[PDB]
Design a protein around this ligand. Structure first.
Ligand code: MG
Ligand code: MG
Ligand code: MG
Ligand code: MG
Lengths: 135, 46, 362
RNA sequence: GCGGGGUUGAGCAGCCUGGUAGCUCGUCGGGCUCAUAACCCGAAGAUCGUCGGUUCAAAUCCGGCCCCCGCAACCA
């Protein structure tokens, strides 16, 4: 019932330019969602994007559960690099160690779909590779 | 801001150049206060 | 750290200058309103509008954001400068320096964008200098200007080349064309297009009077001469028919004459010079080709003429600088920057004027 | 289709029986003049359209290609 993941950084309260019409497409107001996001945020950290479920009921008071922050951003943070996608195999822009990746993995274990953290780590590595960085 | 009505007619190749060969950008030489073109029959207040 | 400090000091000033030229507050305001509009869901029903709006916004945002960053980065550097100095922690100092460098680079990029926005701004140019109506004095002035330009170009790094030069019979040069090769040569010089106004006591005058001579500079980019592509058989309509008068039975029967026609343009070329149809066609085809070329040239001319007319409409505003050597003050009329070191300017210190002009976008 | 041509920046030579780049102007540096012109002196400057060939050797002889200039392109 109108559930879609679509939002920018957590600290930016009330995203008017990027999301705008998308969050207030259905009957739910612009104020509420933003407020909810704000409420969510203060327990952890700002700057990073965070996705959340948007089950828009007929009553309008929607139910929601947060997800872990996206992987790509985390990877970038780990790196200390901004842009590292252009021409990956032809010339290596960035590079990361496995240990770091592993460390990164373990912190998202609640939302991550797996029991063995090894699997998670390898997924993360794969993701990193896709981006452009060689492990 | 009013348009300067140049004497070149229809400008074809280059406008600035045309203007330069125009009265607007004519040479101005000052009248000498002393020297050659310097004699004044009557003063400014004469 | 003295050089570093100096650099830091400079950078703030530079930023301020950029802001001034940009008209930053206005831009910010625009971004705001545009953003608001975007946020409103009714805008995306009209597709053409919406995309345009989006396009508008992003650039504005970039402009603002960059400026904001510039403000902050400098401050950070300053904060860390103290650490570098008194506390004497090396790594921290290094980091600060790095940040400054990065920030500086960013600033440069924005300013570069501002300056060299045009299509041909990257290309090499032909500086054309033409002396004014005066006579000898005017010629001399022109020559001086040329010299100055040459000095500038060399300083920059550009490769100068005197393509054509008409000399003055007494002194100075009547006219001169100079090819100025190098990266962003046109974009650097395009602002110098205009009339330049010298004021000085003439050495060639026997009276020794103060003369006010003018001389034009005109910078145009080396456009690539696009090849004249041949027309298609589909675009042409080809009649063939009998010829006028002539002599015989064979002539009466045969259809040697050829009338080629352009469907897009409505131009025609006939030919019936030759007996052979084929030859006539060839001739006719050639004629048609020639005509197309002429039409393309005509079009080019007309467009140019419009531009010229437009330029003329500015009139007295084509005068961009004023070199007063009696009272020793150079003034750029459009930007308003002044300097009393006239001689220096002449020698080729135009960066102060040029840069400002670029910033302005004039 | 048949001839003639492309040579310092311009206009002309040589090519005439292969090996020598000449004339007039122009350009550049000096002079004369208050200065400029004229005048005087001294210099520089040419892969001979281009590409191949024949030669010990090519502007020069032969051919191809590009461009120019003549002519001829008829008796139905
Ligand atoms: Mg000749
Ligand atoms: Mg001989
Ligand atoms: Mg020889
Ligand atoms: Mg003389």
């Amino acid at each position: 019932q109108a559930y879609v993941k679509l939002q920018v950084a957590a600290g930016m309260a009330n995203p008017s330019p990027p999301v705008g019409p998308a969050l207030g497409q259905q009957g739910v107001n612009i104020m509420e969602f933003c407020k909810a996001f704000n409420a969510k945020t203060d327990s952890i950290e700002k700057g990073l994007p965070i996705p959340v479920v948007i089950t828009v009921y007929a009553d309008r008071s929607f139910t929601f559960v947060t997800k872990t922050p996206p992987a790509a951003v985390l990877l970038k943070k780990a790196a200390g690099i901004k842009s590292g996608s252009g021409k990956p195999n032809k010339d290596k822009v960035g590079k990361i160690s496995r240990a770091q990746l592993q460390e990164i993995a373990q912190t998202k274990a609640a939302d991550m779909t797996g029991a063995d953290i090894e699997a998670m780590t390898r997924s993360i590595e794969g993701t990193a590779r896709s981006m452009g960085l060689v492990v | 801001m009013s348009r300067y009505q140049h004497t070149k007619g229809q400008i074809k190749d280059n406008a600035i150049e045309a203007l330069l060969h125009d009265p607007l950008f004519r040479q101005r030489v000052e009248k000498n206060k002393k020297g050659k073109g310097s004699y004044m029959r009557k003063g400014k207040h004469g | 750290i003295n050089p570093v400090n100096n650099r830091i000091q400079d950078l703030t000033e530079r930023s301020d200058v950029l802001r001034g030229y940009l008209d930053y507050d206005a831009k910010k305001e625009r971004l705001e309103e545009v953003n608001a509009e975007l946020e409103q869901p009714d805008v995306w029903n009209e597709p053409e509008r919406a995309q345009a709006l989006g396009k508008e916004r992003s650039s504005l945002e970039a402009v603002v954001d960059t400026l904001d960053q510039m403000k902050q980065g400098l401050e950070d550097v300053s904060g860390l400068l103290e650490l570098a100095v008194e506390a004497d922690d090396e790594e921290t100092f290094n980091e600060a320096v790095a940040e400054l460098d990065a920030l500086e680079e960013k600033l440069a990029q924005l300013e570069f964008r501002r300056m060299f926005s045009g299509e041909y701004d990257s290309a090499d140019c032909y500086l054309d200098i033409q002396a004014g109506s005066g006579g000898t004095e005017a010629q001399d002035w022109a020559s001086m200007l040329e010299r100055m330009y040459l000095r500038w170009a060399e300083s920059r790094g550009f490769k100068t080349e005197i393509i054509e030069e008409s000399e003055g019979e007494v002194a100075g040069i009547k006219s001169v064309t100079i090819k100025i090769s190098g990266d962003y040569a046109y974009g650097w010089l395009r602002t110098e297009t205009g009339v330049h106004r010298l004021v000085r006591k003439s050495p060639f005058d026997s009276g020794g009077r103060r003369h006010t001579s003018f001389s034009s500079a005109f910078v145009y980019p080396e456009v690539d001469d696009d090849i004249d592509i041949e027309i298609n058989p589909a675009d042409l309509r080809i009649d063939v028919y009998r010829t006028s008068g002539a002599g015989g039975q064979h002539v009466n029967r045969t259809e040697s004459a050829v009338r080629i026609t352009h469907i897009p343009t409505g131009i025609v070329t006939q030919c019936q010079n030759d007996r052979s149809q084929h030859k006539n066609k060839d001739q006719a085809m050639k004629q048609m080709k020639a005509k197309l070329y002429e039409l393309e040239m005509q079009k080019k001319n007309a467009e140019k003429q419009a531009m010229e007319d437009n330029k003329s409409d500015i009139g007295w505003g084509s005068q961009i600088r004023s070199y007063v050597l009696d009272d020793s003050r150079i003034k750029d009329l459009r930007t308003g920057v002044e300097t009393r070191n006239t001689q220096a300017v002449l020698d080729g210190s135009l960066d102060q004027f040029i840069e400002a002009s670029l910033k302005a976008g004039l």
